[model samples]
Target: QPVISAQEQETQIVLYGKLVEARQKHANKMDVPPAILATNKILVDMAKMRPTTVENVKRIDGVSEGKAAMLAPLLEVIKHFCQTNSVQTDLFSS
Candidate 1:
């Protein structure tokens, strides 16, 4: 797993929690069924991976090809949020 400080891990948890809530809201609005997105386990890996691209996000464990395709947009979301918030978005890289 990618190394993360306690603070960084906490922040990622919060960020990914927001992502989950946002996804839930979007799913509800679009009438998307459940189990379509990454689960919490997979999401944690996503946060740890901090993938910089759509394809890389898919490479996260527990993410299948189709789910990766759908969830890939979150790479941009994470990037945007961390950049705007001054968070270390690429915790692993550092």
Candidate 2:
């Protein structure tokens, strides 16, 4: 049997927090239906990876320029938090 890894656990927590923050921020800023934002696959993907660039995030499905603009700052916050915490992340790879 394989032993559990600290890095793996840390990554999971970081990802979860990042996603929650993204969702909250988006909901607060946009009056759009919650279902539209929540059901957005690309936003979900962006939350998972915490993309570093608007362009990178725009690559996700249903991510329009408007949505990307709205999401850029939130994603940046998550990226900065991970960096400050010394958490390793590769959004593109994930």
Q: Which candidate gets the maximum TM-score versus the true structure?
A: 1
Backbone clashes in candidate 2 total 0
**lDDT tens digits, residues 1-94, model 1?**
7665788878788777767775676567658853466677766766666665766675676777777667755666777777777675443432
Q: Could you tell me every candidate's TM-score relative to the true structure? A: 0.71, 0.61
Runs of candidate 2 with Cα error greater than 4 angstroms are: 1-6, 38-40
Q: Please report, in order, the local distance difference test score of every candidate based on alpha carbons.
A: 0.67, 0.64
lDDT: worst 10-residue window of model 2? 34-43
Candidate 1 TM-score versus the reference: 0.71
For candidate 1, what is the lDDT? 0.67
The count of residue-pair clashes in candidate 1 stands at 0
